[PDB]
Amino acid sequence: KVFGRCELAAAMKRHGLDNYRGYSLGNWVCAAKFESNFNTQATNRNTDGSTDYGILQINSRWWCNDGRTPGSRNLCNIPCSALLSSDITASVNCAKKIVSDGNGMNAWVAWRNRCKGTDVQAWIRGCRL
Ligand SMILES: [Pt+2]
Ligand SMILES: [Pt+2]
Numbered sequence: 641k642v643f644g645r646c647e648l649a650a651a652m653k654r655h656g657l658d659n660y661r662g663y664s665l666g667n668w669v670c671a672a673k674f675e676s677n678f679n680t681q682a683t684n685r686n687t688d689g690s691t692d693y694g695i696l697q698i699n700s701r702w703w704c705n706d707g708r709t710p711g712s713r714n715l716c717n718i719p720c721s722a723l724l725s726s727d728i729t730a731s732v733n734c735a736k737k738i739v740s741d742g743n744g745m746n747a748w749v750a751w752r753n754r755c756k757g758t759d760v761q762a763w764i765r766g767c768r769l
Contacts, residue, residue, distance in 0.1 A: 703716045
């Protein structure tokens with residue numbers, strides 16, 4: 641599923657990402673935009689052999705098992721294909737663990753390089769929330 645901007649802000653808010661560990665909703669929507677273009681089906685291969693899955697591009701190196709990432713962890717204890725559903729629950733619930741692990745949103749390379757330090761509130765402008 642490809643979400644609209646405000647549609648995803650609302651889903652993220654419902655699942656408790658609004659200011660989760662101090663990251664305003666605009667951060668999360670910005671991260672989604674530049675990670676997946678709001679596409680729950682997005683998958684991308686990393687140079688190390690791991691793959692990033694779903695709307696927040698969660699990596700099989702650490703967070704999920706995709707059957708083909710040797711010597712990796714599965715810290716959200718899920719198959720990586722769970723992160724590709726049209727329901728974002730699994731991605732959100734795993735993102736909560738990732739962002740709580742000491743590195744905050746810096747775990748998302750697109751967030752660091754394209755959202756961090758920017759006027760992220762623009763990402764939720766005009767949405768009924
Ligand atoms: Pt939902
Ligand atoms: Pt939830």
